[PDB]
Design an enzyme around this catalytic site. Sequence first.
Site, short mmCIF file in Angstrom:
data_model
loop_
_atom_site.label_atom_id
_atom_site.label_comp_id
_atom_site.label_asym_id
_atom_site.label_seq_id
_atom_site.Cartn_x
_atom_site.Cartn_y
_atom_site.Cartn_z
N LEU A 24 10.23 72.90 51.00
CA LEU A 24 8.82 73.47 50.37
C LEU A 24 9.11 73.94 48.88
O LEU A 24 9.76 75.04 48.68
CB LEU A 24 8.25 74.56 51.13
CG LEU A 24 7.95 74.00 52.81
CD1 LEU A 24 7.77 75.49 53.46
CD2 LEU A 24 6.58 73.00 52.90
N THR A 25 8.87 73.26 47.76
CA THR A 25 8.84 73.66 46.37
C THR A 25 7.84 74.89 46.30
O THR A 25 6.41 74.64 46.51
CB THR A 25 8.53 72.31 45.53
OG1 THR A 25 9.47 71.43 45.54
CG2 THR A 25 8.23 72.93 44.10
N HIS A 175 16.33 63.53 48.38
CA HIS A 175 14.86 63.23 48.38
C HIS A 175 14.71 61.77 47.97
O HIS A 175 14.73 61.47 46.77
CB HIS A 175 14.31 64.19 47.39
CG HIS A 175 12.90 64.59 47.62
ND1 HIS A 175 12.01 63.89 48.32
CD2 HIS A 175 12.03 65.65 47.15
CE1 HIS A 175 10.92 64.28 48.42
NE2 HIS A 175 10.68 65.39 47.83
N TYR A 180 8.74 60.70 43.77
CA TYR A 180 10.26 61.30 42.94
C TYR A 180 10.82 60.24 42.31
O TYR A 180 10.44 58.97 42.62
CB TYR A 180 10.96 62.31 43.55
CG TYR A 180 9.87 63.54 44.05
CD1 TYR A 180 9.34 64.02 42.85
CD2 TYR A 180 9.75 64.09 45.28
CE1 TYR A 180 8.49 65.25 43.03
CE2 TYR A 180 8.95 65.18 45.23
CZ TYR A 180 8.27 65.60 44.42
OH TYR A 180 7.29 66.98 44.69
N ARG A 267 -1.00 57.79 57.18
CA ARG A 267 -2.39 58.29 57.03
C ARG A 267 -2.82 58.56 58.42
O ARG A 267 -4.14 57.64 58.84
CB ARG A 267 -3.20 57.63 56.26
CG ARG A 267 -2.86 57.46 54.76
CD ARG A 267 -3.84 57.41 53.75
NE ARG A 267 -4.72 58.59 54.24
CZ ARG A 267 -6.18 58.65 53.38
NH1 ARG A 267 -6.42 58.16 52.43
NH2 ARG A 267 -6.94 59.81 53.66
N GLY A 287 1.35 66.14 59.83
CA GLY A 287 0.47 66.20 60.95
C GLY A 287 0.73 67.04 62.07
O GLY A 287 -0.13 67.34 62.74
N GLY A 308 5.59 72.13 57.59
CA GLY A 308 5.56 72.56 56.33
C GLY A 308 4.44 73.62 55.98
O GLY A 308 4.95 74.76 56.26
C1 LIG Z 1 3.53 74.04 48.83
C2 LIG Z 1 4.32 72.63 49.24
C3 LIG Z 1 5.68 72.39 48.78
C4 LIG Z 1 6.39 71.29 49.16
N1 LIG Z 1 7.51 70.78 48.76
C5 LIG Z 1 8.20 69.78 49.19
C6 LIG Z 1 9.58 69.43 48.71
O1 LIG Z 1 9.85 70.21 47.87
N2 LIG Z 1 10.21 68.48 49.28
C7 LIG Z 1 9.53 67.71 50.33
O2 LIG Z 1 9.93 66.80 50.65
N3 LIG Z 1 8.48 67.90 50.73
C8 LIG Z 1 7.58 69.00 50.33
N4 LIG Z 1 6.32 69.21 50.95
C9 LIG Z 1 5.78 68.58 51.83
C10 LIG Z 1 6.39 69.22 53.31
O3 LIG Z 1 7.60 68.85 53.34
C11 LIG Z 1 4.96 68.83 53.95
O4 LIG Z 1 3.97 69.16 53.55
C12 LIG Z 1 5.02 69.30 55.68
O5 LIG Z 1 6.18 68.72 56.36
C13 LIG Z 1 3.67 68.49 56.06
O6 LIG Z 1 3.25 69.04 57.34
P1 LIG Z 1 1.63 68.59 57.50
O7 LIG Z 1 1.38 67.17 57.11
O8 LIG Z 1 2.42 67.97 58.52
O9 LIG Z 1 1.06 69.28 58.49
C14 LIG Z 1 5.61 70.56 50.24
C15 LIG Z 1 4.44 71.00 50.96
C16 LIG Z 1 3.71 71.98 50.27
C17 LIG Z 1 2.36 72.29 50.97
#
Ligand SMILES: Cc1cc2nc3c(=O)[nH]c(=O)nc-3n(C[C@H](O)[C@H](O)[C@H](O)COP(=O)(O)O)c2cc1C
Length: 351
Positions: A24-25, A175, A180, A267, A287, A308
Site C-alpha cells: 500500500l503506497t 510489481h 507501472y 471487474r 474485493g 488493501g
Molecule cells: C492507498 C492505496 C495504496 C496502494 N498501493 C499499492 C501498491 O503500492 N502496490 C500495489 O500493488 N497495490 C497497491 N494498492 C492496491 C491494494 O494492493 C488493493 O487496493 C487491495 O488489495 C484491494 O482490496 P480491495 O479491492 O480488494 O477490496 C493500493 C491501494 C490503496 C487504496
Amino acid sequence: SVPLLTPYKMGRFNLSHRVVLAPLTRQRSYGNVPQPHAAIYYSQRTTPGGFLITEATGVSDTAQGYQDTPGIWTKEHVEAWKPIVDAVHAKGGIFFCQIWHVGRVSNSGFQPNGKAPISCSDKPLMPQIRSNGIDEALFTPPRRLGIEEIPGIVNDFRLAARNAMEAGFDGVEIHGANGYLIDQFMKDTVNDRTDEYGGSLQNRCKFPLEIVDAVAKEIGPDRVGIRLSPFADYMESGDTNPGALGLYMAESLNKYGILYCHVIEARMHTLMPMRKAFKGTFISAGGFTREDGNEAVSKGRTDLVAYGRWFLANPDLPKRFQVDAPLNKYDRPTFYTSDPVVGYTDYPFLE
Ligand SMILES: Cc1cc2nc3c(=O)[nH]c(=O)nc-3n(C[C@H](O)[C@H](O)[C@H](O)COP(=O)(O)O)c2cc1C
C-alpha cells in the site's frame, strides 16, 4: 475453524493465517526515505507469523511517478528501512518489500534534471488531462526506451532485490501490475515496440520474464514473487486479450518456478483457472471481506488473501477475521496525505 485463519506453508515460511497485508503506497516516506512512522505502521499490522507486503518502493532515481514514495536504492533508504524491518520481525511477521518503477506513469518534475519519464513506448498517458493554460500534459509524455538501456533496467530490479536482502527483508514482490513500468511492456495497447521487447505477446513478456529470471537467481526463487493484474486497465493499461494473460502467466511462471503469484481480481476464467495453473502459492486480492476470503480459502480458490483498504484501516484485521468482529471505516482522504500519524497509525485496535 475459520478458513482465513488456517495456517499455510509458502515456499519455506510458516504463516499463522492467510490474511495478507497488501502492498500500500502511502506517500509518507519524505524525500523517498522511509520514515519512523512506518516502523509503527507496519509493526501495528504484524502478527506472529503474518505475511506483510510493503508499499511500492523505488529501485532508482527515475523509478518514481509521484512524491515521497520510498526508494530502495540509496544506502540511506536502507538504514531508514532496517529498523522498520526489525520491528516487523521482532513481532514475528514475514515481511516482503514490493519493488517497482512507475514507467510511463510519472512526470518531468519527478525525473532528475527534469528528464522525461521513460517507458516501453512514447505513447502518452491520459492526454485529456492538461495543466493550466498550457499544453504540457499532466503526465509528461514518455521517451521510448533505447533498447540498449533495457537490460540495465532489468539489472535495476535485480539490484533492489539484493538490497532488500541487505535491509533484512524476507524477499521481494516484483510489481508487475497497475499501469507501472513492467505492466507497460506487457500490455499491447501500450507496448507497440518493433524490436525484441515488443510487437507480440512473446516480446512483450520478455521484460517481466527477465525480471522473474534475474531476481530469482539473485536472491533465490522461493523468496521471489510477482504481482500482475491482467484484467485491470488502471492508467490506460488495458490489453487486447487480458483473459489470456491470466492463464498464460499462471503457466509461464511455473517454468521459472518461483515462490508465489499474486493477482488482482477483475471487474467482478478470471482467477480460478489461475491458481489451478500456478504450482506455487497463490494470493488473492481485490474485493475480499470475510466470507469472500473465507470462501476462497476453504473452497480452495486461493491460498492467501491480501486485503488493501480494510487492512489499512485496521491494524488488527487477522484477529478480527478470527474473533468475529466488525471493522472500522477507512479514511480515503488520508490514505495519500503526509501526516506521520493522522490516517496512518491512528486506526484503533479492537480492545
Ligand atoms: C492507498 C492505496 C495504496 C496502494 N498501493 C499499492 C501498491 O503500492 N502496490 C500495489 O500493488 N497495490 C497497491 N494498492 C492496491 C491494494 O494492493 C488493493 O487496493 C487491495 O488489495 C484491494 O482490496 P480491495 O479491492 O480488494 O477490496 C493500493 C491501494 C490503496 C487504496
